[PDB]
Amino acid sequence: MLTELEKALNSIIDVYHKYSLIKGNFHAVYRDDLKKLLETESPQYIRKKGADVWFKELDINTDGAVNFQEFLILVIKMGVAAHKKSHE
């Protein structure tokens, strides 16, 4: 049986695929898919930046999609921001 920490990491994989499996490439979250992801999965202070601004930031190779490695950038940034805000 996996630990609670381990299950969280695997659940993060599952979160990505709820959006990446909608259409096209199975490991591609397109710009409209990222908007859906952000509206659904992220807090207001993360969505505040804007879906288009996040997409530009996450799409490192500018191929028009967010793959899993690029998605982990967003997870890292959310994690740091959330730890920062649970500090106060």
């Binding site: 996996l2 630990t3 609670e4 920490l5 381990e6 969280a8 990491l9 695997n10 659940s11 993060i12 994989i13 599952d14 979160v15 695929h17 499996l21 199975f26 659904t40 999965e41 992220s42 807090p43 899993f68 490695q69 982990l72 997870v75 890292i76 959310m78 994690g79 740091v80 959330a82 730890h83 649970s86 500090h87």
Partner: protein, 108 residues
Amino acid sequence: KMSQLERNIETIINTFHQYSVKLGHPDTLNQGEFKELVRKDLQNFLKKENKNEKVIEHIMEDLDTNADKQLSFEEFIMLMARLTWASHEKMHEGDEGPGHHHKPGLGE
């Protein structure tokens, strides 16, 4: 409310914090506490690495960006990203297709 992703991130944060808050600076881990987190909460994902204390020590030295012998949360979350990556890679190891399918991930 709170989404699946937010809950997941909270788990990471709360698991780190339970160790970090005990001694010294309340938001950093020292070497023994890092080793404890790894031994307990990553006992499957890092099963083979756990068998060798020097490997675990090298992992900590690697993450310790500012080289102060402590792990901050910012330093620690890179480890979480790497294991999430490794687990997804394992899910697709030797993937031939067609279509999308996940094998078991890390520790499975």
